[PDB]
Amino acid sequence: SKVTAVRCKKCRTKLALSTSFIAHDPPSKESSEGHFIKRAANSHRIIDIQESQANCSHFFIEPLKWMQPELQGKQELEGKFSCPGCSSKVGGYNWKGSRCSCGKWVIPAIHLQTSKVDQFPLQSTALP
Amino acid sequence: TLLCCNCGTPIDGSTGLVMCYDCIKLTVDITQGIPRE
Amino acid sequence: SGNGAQGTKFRISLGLPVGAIMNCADNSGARNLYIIAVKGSGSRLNRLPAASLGDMVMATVKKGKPELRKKVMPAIVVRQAKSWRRRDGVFLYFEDNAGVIANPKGEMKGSAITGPVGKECADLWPRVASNSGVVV
Amino acid sequence: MATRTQFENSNEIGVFSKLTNTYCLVAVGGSENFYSAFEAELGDAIPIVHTTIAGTRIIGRMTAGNRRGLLVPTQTTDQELQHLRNSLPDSVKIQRVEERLSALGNVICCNDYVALVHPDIDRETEELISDVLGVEVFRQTISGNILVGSYCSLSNQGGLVHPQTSVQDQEELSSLLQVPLVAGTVNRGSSVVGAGMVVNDYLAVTGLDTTAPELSVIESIFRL
Amino acid sequence: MKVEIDSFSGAKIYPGRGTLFVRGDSKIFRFQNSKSASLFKQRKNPRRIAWTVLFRKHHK
RNA sequence: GCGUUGGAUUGUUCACCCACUAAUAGGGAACGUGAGCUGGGUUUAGACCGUCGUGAGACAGGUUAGUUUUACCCUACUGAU
Numbered sequence: 047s048k049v050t051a052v053r054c055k056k057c058r059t060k061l062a063l064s065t066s067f068i069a070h071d072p073p074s075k076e077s078s079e080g081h082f083i084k085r086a087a088n089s090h091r092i093i094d095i096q097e098s099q100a101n102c103s104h105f106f107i108e109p110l111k112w113m114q115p116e117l118q119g120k121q122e123l124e125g126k127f128s129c130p131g132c133s134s135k136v137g138g139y140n141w142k143g144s145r146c147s148c149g150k151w152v153i154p155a156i157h158l159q160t161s162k163v164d165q166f167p168l169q170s171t172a173l174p
Numbered sequence: 175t176l177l178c179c180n181c182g183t184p185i186d187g188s189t190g191l192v193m194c195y196d197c198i199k200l201t202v203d204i205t206q207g208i209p210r211e
Numbered sequence: 212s213g214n215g216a217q218g219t220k221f222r223i224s225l226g227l228p229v230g231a232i233m234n235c236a237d238n239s240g241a242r243n244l245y246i247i248a249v250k251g252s253g254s255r256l257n258r259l260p261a262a263s264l265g266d267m268v269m270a271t272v273k274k275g276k277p278e279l280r281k282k283v284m285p286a287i288v289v290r291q292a293k294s295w296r297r298r299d300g301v302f303l304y305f306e307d308n309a310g311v312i313a314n315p316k317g318e319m320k321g322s323a324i325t326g327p328v329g330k331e332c333a334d335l336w337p338r339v340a341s342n343s344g345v346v347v
Numbered sequence: 348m349a350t351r352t353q354f355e356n357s358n359e360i361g362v363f364s365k366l367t368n369t370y371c372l373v374a375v376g377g378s379e380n381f382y383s384a385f386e387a388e389l390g391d392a393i394p395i396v397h398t399t400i401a402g403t404r405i406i407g408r409m410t411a412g413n414r415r416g417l418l419v420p421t422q423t424t425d426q427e428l429q430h431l432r433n434s435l436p437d438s439v440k441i442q443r444v445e446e447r448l449s450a451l452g453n454v455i456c457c458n459d460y461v462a463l464v465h466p467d468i469d470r471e472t473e474e475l476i477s478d479v480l481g482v483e484v485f486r487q488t489i490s491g492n493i494l495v496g497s498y499c500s501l502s503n504q505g506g507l508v509h510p511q512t513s514v515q516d517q518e519e520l521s522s523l524l525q526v527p528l529v530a531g532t533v534n535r536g537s538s539v540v541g542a543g544m545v546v547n548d549y550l551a552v553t554g555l556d557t558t559a560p561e562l563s564v565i566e567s568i569f570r571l
Numbered sequence: 572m573k574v575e576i577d578s579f580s581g582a583k584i585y586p587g588r589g590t591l592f593v594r595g596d597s598k599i600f601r602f603q604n605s606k607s608a609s610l611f612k613q614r615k616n617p618r619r620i621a622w623t624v625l626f627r628k629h630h631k
Numbered sequence: 632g633c634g635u636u637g638g639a640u641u642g643u644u645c646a647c648c649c650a651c652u653a654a655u656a657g658g659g660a661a662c663g664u665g666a667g668c669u670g671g672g673u674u675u676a677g678a679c680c681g682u683c684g685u686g687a688g689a690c691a692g693g694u695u696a697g698u699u700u701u702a703c704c705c706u707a708c709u710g711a712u
């Protein structure tokens with residue numbers, strides 16, 4: 047396949063490129079990975095039995111040269127980020143959670159939404 | 175000579191229609207609000 | 212009242228109460244609409260509710276295209292015959308009461324509104340403005 | 348380029364705005380996001396004029412203007428025409444039309460060279476259109492829909508029509524407008540495409556709830 | 572501010588006086604008072620109604 | 632404190648749908664209120680049916696017709712000297 051590029055919606059600015067987006071094997075589904083576990087106040091009690099969704103509603107990327115000044119200035123645990131040419135939020139940063147939309151705990155990495163975010167091929171269109 | 179506008183790919187007719195057949199199959203419901211038991 | 216409506220309308224004189232059979236102005240296949248209720252109408256004892264220009268009503272088709280009748284559907288009153296006052300002083304009235312079948316979001320079901328359409332109806336809905344040739 | 352916005356909470360941007368190659372008209376409804384969706388992607392080659400004609404905020408359905416002229420209906424007043432004249436470049440001519448069909452943006456679908464006109468327009472009107480706009484007319488319905496200015500958004504580069512357009516009719520529209528078209532939709536499936544979005548030769552504003560396959564086929568054909 | 576004319580008789584309609592009537596063939600009529608409006612409703616002809624501007628202009 | 636609806640069927644209270652709405656809460660005041668109204672129901676006399684009775688007749692069963700009177704007095708209230 048050919049290379050792609052992911053950009054923002056309501057604003058025309060290029061956010062990131064291809065050679066990213068690890069698939070990371072979304073389903074396992076034994077008893078607890080496909081279930082959105084909400085532990086209660088005591089006794090490791092699990093009330094909410096929510097099946098995980100089928101679609102992958104997040105993009106998983108690498109740290110970026112546009113992400114370097116935000117990571118360098120006033121570093122905290124979890125926050126939010128946006129576009130420099132706009133003010134529409136694209137997600138947040140974390141190194142201890144913010145699992146997926148499918149919901150597995152992964153290595154510390156930056157996520158990207160696909161709500162108010164779209165993707166386009168870097169080459170020309172197919173011209174139907 | 176159109177495009178689905180939900181998934182994007184299939185060209186559909188000018189008979190009077192909407193997004194693709196799989197898109198109305200999986201996204202659009204008209205059977206909601208009933209108990210199945 | 213604000214079911215997909217754009218802004219807030221002034222109080223037009225209440226032209227046609229429930230039970231009024233107005234014409235149908237668009238090419239939906241209907242020919243007349245029997246007003247059964249008005250959306251966003253205040254309740255007073257014995258006061259049966261009335262619809263002005265630009266109001267969204269619930270109505271029923273009484274003639275034409277049997278796919279459409281025997282069901283309750285929203286309509287929008289685009290012409291009335293009761294003379295009402297515009298705030299710039301003019302009193303005006305059309306020669307017939309006429310409405311247009313729409314969905315609850317305000318989007319129409321037809322494709323062209325034959326005849327004129329009041330400004331107070333065309334402004335309050337951006338879909339009635341898109342489908343009307345003559346305005347006032 | 349591609350831009351989404353809303354006027355107040357509605358996605359019909361072509362109802363509340365009229366964008367062309369020389370100017371751009373908008374209505375007075377607040378929404379600094381709606382104003383910035385023009386003035387953030389616009390240099391000062393085109394002036395963004397705030398106006399209501401006949402007191403109506405539906406200005407994009409009641410004006411039918413070109414790059415070299417503006418047609419306001421018979422219901423507009425003198426003051427809101429003077430406000431147009433004192434804030435617009437003099438290469439255009441703001442001529443007030445007196446004919447019957449008051450929604451000029453609904454009954455007229457014009458770009459800089461050709462003008463598609465609703466059939467029952469008055470015979471005095473199209474010669475006035477060719478006087479003020481320097482543009483020949485074509486009195487043909489897009490597809491039985493006699494409202495040609497709201498079911499067809501048109502620029503010099505490309506065109507766009509509603510998805511009921513027959514393939515035999517897209518040929519006739521392309522041959523008379525000398526411009527390729529596509530049967531597409533806008534704003535999650537609204538077939539009123541000339542009102543759901545507004546276009547320039549370099550800017551296409553769209554409603555906020557439009558999809559990526561909608562914007563792809565808008566920006567594919569309206570740039571060329 | 573703009574002054575307008577009665578359509579039947581030819582009287583200068585001042586703002587806030589008279590009625591308007593938008594006919595179903597999308598023609599708009601102005602009436603300065605209920606006499607002129609009712610004479611329009613009774614299908615009368617302003618070229619026959621003697622006190623209008625039309626009678627005085629046709630009879631010179 | 633302030634509101635608590637518009638209708639289809641039924642004499643109906645009750646019930647039941649339709650629809651709007653912020654909401655269509657429950658009750659009382661001689662089961663509020665007929666010199667305030669109406670008279671659909673019930674509840675006289677006419678008549679028909681069905682069942683019962685030998686019969687005259689019965690039915691809390693069905694059906695249709697069937698006069699609704701007075702304030703000028705005292706108080707109360709509303710206004711006025």
Ligand SMILES: [Zn+2]
Pocket residue numbers: 054055056057058059129131132133134
């Ligand atoms: Zn942005």
Ligand SMILES: [Zn+2]
Pocket residue numbers: 072102146147148149
């Ligand atoms: Zn996943």
Ligand SMILES: [Zn+2]
Pocket residue numbers: 178180181182183184193194195196197
């Ligand atoms: Zn599809």
